[PDB]
Each structure stands twice: as C-alpha cells, then as structure tokens.
Design a protein around this nucleic acid. Structure first.
Lengths: 77, 78
RNA sequence: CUUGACUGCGAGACAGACACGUCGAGCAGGUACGAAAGUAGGUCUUAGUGAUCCGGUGGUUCUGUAUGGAAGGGCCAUCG
RNA sequence: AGCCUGCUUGUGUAGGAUAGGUGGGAGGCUUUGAAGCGUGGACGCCAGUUCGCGUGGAGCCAUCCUUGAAAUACCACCCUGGCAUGCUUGAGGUUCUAACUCUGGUCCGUAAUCCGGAUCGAGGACAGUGUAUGGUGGGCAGUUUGACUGGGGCGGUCUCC
RNA sequence: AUUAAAAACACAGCACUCUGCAAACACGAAAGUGGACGUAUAGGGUGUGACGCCUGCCCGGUGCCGGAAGGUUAAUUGAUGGGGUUAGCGCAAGCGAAGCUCUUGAUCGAAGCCCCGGUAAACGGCGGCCGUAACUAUAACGGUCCUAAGGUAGCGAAAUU
RNA sequence: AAUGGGUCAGCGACUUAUAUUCAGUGGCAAGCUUAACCGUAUAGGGUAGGCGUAGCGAAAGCGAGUCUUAAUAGGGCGUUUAGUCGCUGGGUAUAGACCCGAAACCGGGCGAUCUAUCCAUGAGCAGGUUGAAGGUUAGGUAACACUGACUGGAGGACCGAACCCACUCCCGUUGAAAAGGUAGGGGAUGACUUGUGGAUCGGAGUGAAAGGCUAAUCAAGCUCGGAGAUAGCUGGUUCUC
RNA sequence: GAGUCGGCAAACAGACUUUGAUCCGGAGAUCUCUGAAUGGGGGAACCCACCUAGGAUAACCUAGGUAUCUUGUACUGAAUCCAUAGGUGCAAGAGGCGAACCAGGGGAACUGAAACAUCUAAGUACCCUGAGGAAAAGAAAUCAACCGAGAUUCCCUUAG
C-alpha cells in the first residue's frame, strides 16, 4: 500500500477547514517515490518504495544498515 | 562530505572534501566506485592504502597511449 | 463673555410585561455671566434611532496560572 | 545581487594642471621628476593624464611659484566611473547522464502479452507524484429562499413622531 | 411492464469541435481496464435529422481559441520599524549592548482577472419612441433616438393569430 | 348531513434514574449531614465534601463595610434574633420522558431467476408474390454506347400463419386475470423473436429517452441497523365525592 | 444394589440382570460425510485423483501420506563470472468460530440549536484489524509553590 518501507509512514486522515470553517474529511498521503539504492556489499541495486524523509534516513544511517532492519521486520528487499 | 578518487573528470579531485548537492552524491558519486560518505569507520583505513592507489592511477593515461593510436585510423567499412 | 451642550450624584414621581424610557435640588470639582436677588445639568415641547456578542482606542488602583514582569482578562470612557 | 587584489581614470568660476578623502609629509636629488619641442599607443564633463621620451644614464610640472572655499613630492587606508576574473546566491536557453519515467526491443525467472531482474533504446532533471498554495468548479453536496394578508399570489407594509 | 405508440425517440445523411496514441474520453482512492489489439477516410462528444432548393444580419453579453506583455494577485521569502524581558553604566531616576521573544511586513512570487483580437451548424440576439399612412399592435418611410445588429430569402389568421 | 366506534372479551397511555426547588411531616440544632469505602453488613465506623453561621465589591481587598471622584462630602447592597439532613407530595432540568403516528436522512448488507442494455453459445421464422445488381444471347454501334430476349434472385421489399407485439371497440372492474378475454389490428429475413449461461446496482447501474426500468415497489430498490429520528401537528389518556 | 432395553409413546415382542446389568463420574477406543476443509475440483454434505508400503487371479483392497502462507533449515542455481532471485525437500507455526469486555484503523446522519452553515448529535452507530482472560496503562524529561508530594488504573469529591 502507500506505506514507506523504511519509516512505516502510511496515510493519515484529517480535515479541510474552509474560510467558513466547514470541515471536509481528507487524507494526508506520504511523499512516496520508488528509488534504486546501490548496495556495495551485494553489488546490486535494490528498488525500494520510500518516502522522501525515508531517503534522509538512508543518507544518514547507510543503506546497509536500513536494509538490516527491513529484513528484521521481514519485508521485500 | 565525500572522498573523491579520480581526476580525469571536469572537477574530480582526489584529496579535497567538497560539499555538494544531495542527489549528486546518491546517484553518481557513490554507486560508481568514485566516493564514500564522510564516515569515521574507515577514515584511518584510507591512511594505510595511500600507496596502493599510486600504481593503477598512473597507468591510466599510460594505457591510453597506444590504444588511442588505433582509434584515429578510420578503418571501419560502411 | 467666550461655556452649565458642566463632574459626582440625586429625595420623589410619571410611564411601564421585561429590556428600555421621561421629569427633577442642595455640597463640592468648579464655573460663564449680572455690579446683585438669582438664572444656567443644552435648544417652545413631543421624531432625528439600534440591544447583545465580537473587535478598535485612551485611561486604570483591579487581576496578572512558581516568582518578578509582560501577555491576556476585568472595570471606566468612547469608536466601528 | 554580493565579493576580489594591483587599484591605475579626477578634464567646473579660476588655477601652467587635479580635487571622492583624511593623517605623518615641505621638497621631490634611488637612471633629478632625461628635456624645450615632440613620433607612436588610449581616452576627452575636448586639445587633460599614463607607458619603450625619436635618441637614453641630461634640470623638468615651480612642494603658495600664482590661484582655488581643502594643493601638487615622500607614504599608509578606502569608495566611486569601475577593469580582468577566481569565490559565489537569482531568473533563461539549449545541452549532458546518472535520478526518475517508458502501456519499446531483447534475455532470464518460465511451459507467462502479468510481474520483477538483467541489458539495449528513447525521453530526461522535464514529466510525474506527495505537500503547501492561487484560480476555475451545479460535476457533486448540505442548505436557505420572512411575516402581515377580508384565501393565496401581485402591490403595499414593517421602527419612530 | 400496469390510462399517453405519437408529431415524441432512433435513423441514414449533414455540420461543428476535441483527440498524434501511454489519444480525447470513461470506470476506477490505485494498479488496471474500456476506447482498441483500433490510429485522423479513426475514435469521443455536441447539435440537426432522407432528399430538393437553400441556410441572411450581429463577436456587445457569456463561453471557447489565440495574444502581447503592462497593472492588480497566493503560499513562500523576512528588509525595516515598533514593542516584552535584563546585563550593565549612572548615587538613584534612567536608558539599556547582547541575547531570547512577540508583532510589523519592504522586496521576491505564477496562473487567473483587467486588457487586445478572432469565433455564432458556439450559448445567444435580430429594437421601442411617438405623431406618420392605415389598423387593433407593423421598418414603406422623413425619421427622433437607441443598440453589437435591428430580420434576408422563404413562408404566413399557421401544430404559431 | 363534522370526527371516531360492527359488537364482545382481553390488552392499551404521566413512568424511572439522577440533579434541584417549594410545601407538608420528622430527627438533630449554631450547627447539621456524610460520599466512596471499611464492616462477623439495613448496625457501627468513615465528616473528604456539601450547605448554614456575613456581607459588599468586577477585583485586590475591607469587613458589620466597599465604589466614585483630588474629595471620609451626597445614594445602592448588607447588618442585632435558624439552620440542616431525611421522608412524602407539587413543580423544573437532563434522559425515548403521557401514549401512538410521518414523509424523510445516514451506515452495513441483499438482489439483474422480473426488467433494462450487454456478452458467449444454441434455434425459430407455413405459404404465396415482387423481380435489383450481375450474367448470357441476339440486335446495334470505331470497341464505349444503347434497346430486345432469356437467366438471375436483391431487399431494415410486399401479402400472410407460427411467433413477437399491443392501435381500436366492448366485456370484465368484489374480475376467470393486482392489466386479461372476444372480435378486428401492427411487424413478421430482421435495427427480428427466443432458450441457456454470464456481466453491470442504489446519487449506482441501465435507458432507439418515458423519470422509463433495476423481482406486482422507483424524481433514488429491498432489508437490517442509527431509532422509541423529528413532529410548534393529529388522535387518544381508564375509579368516586 | 434391583431393576432394565432414551423421549413424544402406551402397549407389545424378543431379551438382559445378585456370577451384579440399566443408571452415575474418571480415563481410553471408535468417530462416515460436509464445514477453516487442507490432495484437485464443486452447485456444502458430491466428483476425480496421485505417491509409498503390504495384501489380492485380467476388478481391487488395507494403513499412511499429498493444501497454502509465514519463519527456520538443508540441498539445488538464471540472465551473469562470482552469488542473488528462483526451484525442491524437511522441521515448526498460522488460518476458522464465539454474546460482551479491550487496544487501534476508518467513520456517519436524522436530531438539538425552536431555520441553518460554525457547533451539536459524537469519535456515538457502523465497518475493519489485532490481542487477552482480562486488556490497555504504568515506575516521572509528573505535579506542585519555595512548603512539599512521588508509578499506573479505579471509585468518591472538588464542581456543573
């Protein structure tokens, strides 16, 4: 679904307050892209549907450590 | 935030640490064996391999000497 | 003259379902005036108007979420 | 748009010429500031200045010498018309490939017009999506659309004297 | 279906408009599917409704299409100003550097709109003002005006008087 | 000659909880009373709290006293002297709140065995007419034309049964029938009729378009929930003095 | 410890029991077909199979196996050299049902406001997903005013 494979961010619900303060029920989607992360210690790209601050966690912790606890949770790649 | 390792590019250095755009590290510099992020996990391992780089990086123009002498003969038949 | 188109009030009434509304001295702050008794709390009288809640402004002695302050609130004045 | 070093151009009244400016500085004599005229080179708020003076190891521009509201050399710091360009932040254009995209080819998983993976090709930092935002929006929706009244509608009326 | 079988709807033909293919479009929070295993002689939508003779005038309003590039304009940006706290100097009154904070909000911002042109087999429009002539109501006129322009061929007391 | 009731017998409409006010009746009394809870449990403990003994003011505050203004000067409120917790009634508040009763709105389902289109695969259309294009031939032309003859068998062709429809009359209207029948009528090789299986569904399908159809229901199906919706409206509300 | 062969269902048959039945508890055996349904299909209670072991004379039979997914493990190995994907076998576990309670995800509307839109109704109804016998919460980056109190949950008050 629309969940980040790194952060676990899914869609959130909320309102659409107008000028006359009418509430319309909407949904907050996360900023998901697909992206191919290069892994040196496998010599292989892994393509990963990830939110855009899930890539900030790749850039901070390394893909070799984020993939360590994607498979601890037991996901695709 | 990267350690460059080649010099035949437009702005490729070897010993300068530059601060560049975030996408330029992700997609080009890191997956091409051309850099690594500024981590202290092998930064002292760079200092025990400083004389292994001085062999292949010097033949890089020396093996492009006679290989270029068959590139300009224009002997491809159409 | 150049301010009583005063400030604090106010016995007691009239009207009145209520909210409203109408009439009305003496001490002072203090007064124009009159040289004085005294008259003056707008206009001969009855129309010329609009609640509350939100804001705005100027005061304030009041409040001021541990304390000192501020913010916000209250009170009084007045605007939309 | 900022920044940068050597920082060189100051052409009004008048002054031989020059005022963006303050201090030591009253002589510049280290080939004097090689020179009267002046060849060539730039520029001119037009005949003002700088460099091999055409020759070269020579007194010219005279520091109040006169004038101008502050003066001419010695030597330290800065901004200007701004100069080349490194260091860089803003809006273009076409370009590059490596993000992304492909409802293109080819392989493989595979006995598959799905799907991935590999590769070739194309587009390419666009497209597209998330989020924030302006515009449009009866496509859809929740509603409102007063009372009096010789029935209702039309008209008039609604508070005050 | 069960009071309306018709003049209604459909239609062949016609025109307008969109759509270059991962098509317009439609169903889908999405993948996907339909369009279509089609490709502008095709597909979608709109209106007219065989055929014959034909299809006048009006681009103001509203829509759509194109256009300079000016003015107004959103998030975002955060110049400058005004405050709140308090180190500290001054005997104190005071101001108050720095912070931190609350408001202010110059600049920077696109489409749209204002603006300009085209478009009516786009949605639409094809006058009322009087005396004229006459009569129930008229563009034939001189018209007065007014408007984007004031009805052409046809037809006419009509499925309309 | 306005409503309701054929009749009988049963049933059927002011309740309950929690807050509160007033009255009556009690216990204690300047005090009164406990709540959870404890409890060998309707006892007893538990006085946290609630109300009372003091008010006035927006408030700091002051108190048998503030405000106001520079004004202790002038009025409003209070003030010597009974309350509390039960219990039983009368009201009120919040709950469906005396009972019954909408059209409707929303949420989860069920349904295309009827019907509306569509998809796949099957088959139905007695009989009689008409005589398109093409052929062949003669005749005619420079071959092209162009006229006979023969053949051919086209068509949202014609006439007509099955079949499918449903224009008209009458009957029927408590029907034989919640849409028929009888006598006539339209199409009947097609944009036809039909069996079987399938696809699409409720602001949603489907519709040669009537708001039609989506199981005798359709300007938004059925069913179950929100739900005892709401009803300033209607009707009804039962022994006696 | 003297009657019994369940009930509607009383009778009748043929019987069983003091060598102890019927009856009552505990344990085991059997337990057809469907149903998560699990070998594959399917219109639930039906249809068609495969593999191994043993037995059976041109027909079968008996006892086991044969689902998927997750995790783990062994062997195997594509594009592609390496080894990843994938394949196969073994173990272990999961699925389904249940009135409420519980933690979450998504979430109305009639209604009240004497209309209605902010608001209410109400994070209610409803749908969905997990867990447990309870669950959640929980051991202070918590409150308090210069005095202190110390996790959480629950009831009573502060207090409408």
């Amino acid at each position: 679904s629309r969940v980040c494979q790194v952060t676990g961010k899914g869609p959130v619900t909320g309102n659409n307050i107008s000028h006359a303060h009418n509430k319309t029920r909407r949904r907050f989607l996360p900023n998901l892209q697909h992206h191919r992360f290069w892994v040196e210690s496998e010599k292989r790209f892994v393509r990963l549907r990830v939110s855009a601050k899930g890539m900030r966690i790749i850039d901070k912790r390394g893909i070799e450590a984020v993939l360590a606890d994607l498979r601890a949770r037991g996901e695709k790649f | 935030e990267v350690i460059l390792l080649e010099k035949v590019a437009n702005l490729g250095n070897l010993g300068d640490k530059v601060n560049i755009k975030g996408g330029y590290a992700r997609n080009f510099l890191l997956p091409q064996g051309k850099a690594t992020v500024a981590t202290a996990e092998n930064v002292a391992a760079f200092e025990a391999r400083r004389a292994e780089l001085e062999k292949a990086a010097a033949e890089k123009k020396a093996a492009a000497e006679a290989r270029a002498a068959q590139l300009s003969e224009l002997v491809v038949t159409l």
